[PDB]
Amino acid sequence: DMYIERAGDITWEKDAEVTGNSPRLDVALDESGDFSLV
Amino acid sequence: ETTDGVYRVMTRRLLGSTQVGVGVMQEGVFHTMWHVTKGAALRSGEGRLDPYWGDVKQDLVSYCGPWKLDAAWDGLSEVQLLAVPPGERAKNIQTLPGIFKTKDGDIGAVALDYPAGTSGSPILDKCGRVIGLYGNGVVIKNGSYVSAITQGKR
């Protein structure tokens, strides 16, 4: 039994925290939808 | 129930519920990643949502209608992950995407590592448009997860 429950509006937030790197990676995508590093 | 918004995807086992992912309701259609539901029907209140389209390679599925989300990352601007973590209110995390470089072109990617039940959380551009869903990606270093910005075709 899977069910869904609303959790918010889809909105951009001016007060969002900022974080995370911006890496550039070579990858491949196989038929199962799995990414792997090249 | 089809009111636009971000939704938790919950599963009830024999004992207790857990959050297995997240999805986007837009224009009457529910959008999530294939691996979250594996195409199974969903309950929404007293109603049933039946799968309509799905593709394992893109890792996407839509319910009640064809895929409606068509915005794409502009390749330059910051974006926001609208993460819906299990047990917590939705929150916006702003980041500059990196890039997955593939033989068939580049794909934006966010180096953000949230709990597994966050898969299907939408990534937003500065106008609030959903440019893709979070949760299919790679691990680079030790535990450093990087998610593709996965978008379908409207």
Is B102:B135 a contact under the CB 8 Å cutoff?
no
Catalytic residues of B: 35, 59, 119
Q: Is A31 on the interface with B (CB under 8 A)?
A: yes
Measure the CA–CA gap between B138 and B145, rounded to whole angstroms: 6
Q: Domain B70-154, what fold?
A: Thrombin, subunit H (2.40.10)
Q: Domain B1-69, what fold?
A: Thrombin, subunit H (2.40.10)
Start and end residues for every CATH 2.40.10.120 domain found in chain B: 1-69
| Resolution of this deposited model, Å | 2.0
Identity (one letter) of the amino acid at B125? D
- DSSP for B2-66, written as a single string: --SEEEEEEEE-SS-EEEEEEEEEETTEEEEEHHHHTT--EEETTEEE-EEEEETTTTEEEESSS
Measure the CA–CA gap between B60 and B44, rounded to whole angstroms: 19
Structure obtained using: X-ray
Give how far Cα B107 sits from Cα of B15, B73, B104, B126, Å.
40, 9, 9, 18
Contacting residues of B for A2, CB less than 8 Å apart: 9-12, 20, 37, 40-43
Domain residue ranges in chain A:
1-38
Question: Which chain B residue has the Cα nearest residue A6?
Answer: B7
Buried/exposed code over B11-22 (b: 16+ C-beta within 10 A; e: otherwise): beeeeeeebbbb
